[PDB]
Design a protein around this ligand. Sequence first.
Ligand SMILES: Cc1cc2nc3c(=O)[nH]c(=O)nc-3n(C[C@H](O)[C@H](O)[C@H](O)COP(=O)(O)OP(=O)(O)OC[C@H]3O[C@@H](n4cnc5c(N)ncnc54)[C@H](O)[C@@H]3O)c2cc1C
Ligand SMILES: Cc1cc2nc3c(=O)[nH]c(=O)nc-3n(C[C@H](O)[C@H](O)[C@H](O)COP(=O)(O)OP(=O)(O)OC[C@H]3O[C@@H](n4cnc5c(N)ncnc54)[C@H](O)[C@@H]3O)c2cc1C
Ligand SMILES: [Cl-]
Ligand SMILES: [Cl-]
Lengths: 393, 393
Amino acid sequence: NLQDARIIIAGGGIGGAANALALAQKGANVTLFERASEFGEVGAGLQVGPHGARILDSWGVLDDVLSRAFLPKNIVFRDAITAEVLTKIDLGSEFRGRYGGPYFVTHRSDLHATLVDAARAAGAELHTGVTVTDVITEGDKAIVSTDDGRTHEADIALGMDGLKSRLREKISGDEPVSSGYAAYRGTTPYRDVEEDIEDVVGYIGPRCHFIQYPLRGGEMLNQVAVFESPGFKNGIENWGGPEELEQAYAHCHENVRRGIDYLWKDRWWPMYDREPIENWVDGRMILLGDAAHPPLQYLASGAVMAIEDAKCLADYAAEDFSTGGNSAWPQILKEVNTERAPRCNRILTTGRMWGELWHLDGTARIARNELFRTRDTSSYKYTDWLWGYSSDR
Amino acid sequence: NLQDARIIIAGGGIGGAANALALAQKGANVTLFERASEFGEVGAGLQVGPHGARILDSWGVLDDVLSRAFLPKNIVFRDAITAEVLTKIDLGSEFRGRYGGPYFVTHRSDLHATLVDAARAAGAELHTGVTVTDVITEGDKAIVSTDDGRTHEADIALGMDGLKSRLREKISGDEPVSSGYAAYRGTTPYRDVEEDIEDVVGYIGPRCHFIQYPLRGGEMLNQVAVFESPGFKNGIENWGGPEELEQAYAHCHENVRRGIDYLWKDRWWPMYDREPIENWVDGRMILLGDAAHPPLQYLASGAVMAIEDAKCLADYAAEDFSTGGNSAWPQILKEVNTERAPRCNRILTTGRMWGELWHLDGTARIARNELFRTRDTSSYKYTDWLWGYSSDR
Ligand SMILES: Cc1cc2nc3c(=O)[nH]c(=O)nc-3n(C[C@H](O)[C@H](O)[C@H](O)COP(=O)(O)OP(=O)(O)OC[C@H]3O[C@@H](n4cnc5c(N)ncnc54)[C@H](O)[C@@H]3O)c2cc1C
Ligand SMILES: Cc1cc2nc3c(=O)[nH]c(=O)nc-3n(C[C@H](O)[C@H](O)[C@H](O)COP(=O)(O)OP(=O)(O)OC[C@H]3O[C@@H](n4cnc5c(N)ncnc54)[C@H](O)[C@@H]3O)c2cc1C
Ligand SMILES: [Cl-]
Ligand SMILES: [Cl-]
């Protein structure tokens, strides 16, 4: 376990919260600093495959999360022009047996709160309204600076400050790479959306897609529209705004076009990722979550990768610190980086190809539709790398 | 049959020759005018699927053509970058039984000569060095003008003057549509090409393809390179010249790049087709062959469609003229047009999509390769429309 260990976590998103939980359950001393004045997340959906669900079950929080989640029966791909069903991924009894957990969807806000509550329950010391302004390594400790003028000593620090990480600048000078696509969300009472949906449905079209799924007990429908922004190509600084939505969907089926009207129009998410990097470690600081590996969201696995990062770090640390103490930390960070970077950088790079496959047009769309139609639905070769991974050694 | 019938054919390519044969075997009086001073065709390969082979067998010329042809065992698609085999179409015993004949390849010159010799044997009067300058219909006859100042009366005329048909101007003012791709050919002694080939091999790559097949007894190898011409986009009048070949293949596998060196460089074929048109009839003149329906050559069926045109016209004419005489000709031309236009215009339009499918790049290429790999090789759904058609009623 981790009793004499001290860890400081910079950032309290889903990643930082899950690391706080996993390390405090091992008996470590955890201090987490979150810049925002309250913990919280967007009150809209996310998807959590069995690669995340199994981990939450290990931490004893899956049952609880599921009480406020929705269990879709399938992921259904449809053509966005014709609305034709192309293929389904069955999330039923064969899938859960293979992958050791359900594929579920829930509100981001609920998952994040449940993680923060369990982290606190397990002993983690969480602080809101505090920004980490620096992390340096001196001798065998990390020295962390906060925006109240204080400094804090720990054995290691986690840089979990997101896609716009400033801690990442210690290791890499790269900048976010624009995809040129923007995401909108909406959540609507299910009854007010204009047949019935019990699945995650993805309509995939030229230069756009549109996703729908129900949330807890089917009361609300989550809707997500992602489209190629002409403003990005044309050089706009604040590209992707809502004046682009009608034109971006004008070639789609009525089921998709009607959906646009339900989206929140006052906020959107221009989609960026970063090129993959191999090394995430600077002395006794490791970058994790989106600060190490921010993806485009086509594989719905960004938060799941931050959860897997938490599991791997706490499991490999408990194994090695038990017998090697504080001196073992730089070897533990190396081993965690070596396990996690190939996994997560394959999600980054394959995710980019997978979104391009959704957004094909012309003859390439005709080929992609037939490839999805004719596949062997009993084969798991397209998914085992993603949903069957485990860091267990 | 056709004994009192008179037909004049404008053009003596493979189309005009095959119509002369089919009509003279029915006992019709056939006069064919060819502009060139000698009958002849390019001494390079063509492919003739069972949709053409069955027809030649009916006319009693298949055995003879086969004596000087090559019988490939498969059509093999390979990726032009990696040389990976993607899929094979087996041309063996299941295929020939299904489609009623072999898929063969031979020299264009040999097929054309064999058709011209059999047409002559059957009674057709062939004339070289004579251009048809006009065709008009007056009463119940076609009146055909030639470039020696003479006029000729027949019951019907066939406009078979090719892709650049001037007779087509009677019916449509359209012009050839450039594909922006150019074709080169070569034939090399098989032994001099730098493993062994017993199939039709198509290497399909971004913005290009490369085809190889052996000719009679495997003595010569036919090679065809088709690539997207940057000169066409850039506005050159005589675009597609050989200075473009190296760059156009520079991303391909060595097997493809080595092939370029064997091509004839003194002549090439900029690839054009025409938009499909429904009506091919002007009074007692019908356009047939490339004058009615010139394709891009991705389905290797242009000459085969002209052969099918010959079979349909002679069969439907023999059926109706037997009992209705000369007065039946305009109804016969209508019925032939109504049978042949949907068939041939589907080859035109599907052929364009099929070449685009070969020339995909990026994620669209990854999708296309997997679609070809994973297909049901026992299913004929992609090919029955093409190789299983018959005009028989
Ligand atoms: C449209 C969209 C849909 C998505 N859908 C899914 C999905 O279905 N499933 C999935 O698994 N993932 C999904 N993701 C990805 C997922 O949202 C992210 O990968 C994940 O939230 C990253 O978590 P994180 O904790 O690493 O970073 P963040 O969530 O960015 O958290 C970083 C935190 O650090 C705080 N902070 C920043 N700087 C400092 C500092 N110096 N000091 C202290 N605090 C700091 C920030 O306030 C923030 O709370 C999606 C992403 C997008 C954009
Ligand atoms: C690179 C390439 C590869 C191909 N590969 C294949 C293949 O493998 N299989 C296949 O089936 N098809 C293939 N084709 C298509 C095939 O070549 C043509 O569809 C077919 O040759 C057309 O025959 P046609 O008789 O209708 O016209 P043409 O061959 O053009 O013949 C028209 C004839 O009319 C003559 N002429 C013109 N004007 C007059 C006039 N006013 N008076 C008298 N005579 C006139 C011309 O001199 C010419 O001989 C390919 C085409 C290309 C470009
Ligand atoms: Cl994601
Ligand atoms: Cl052709």
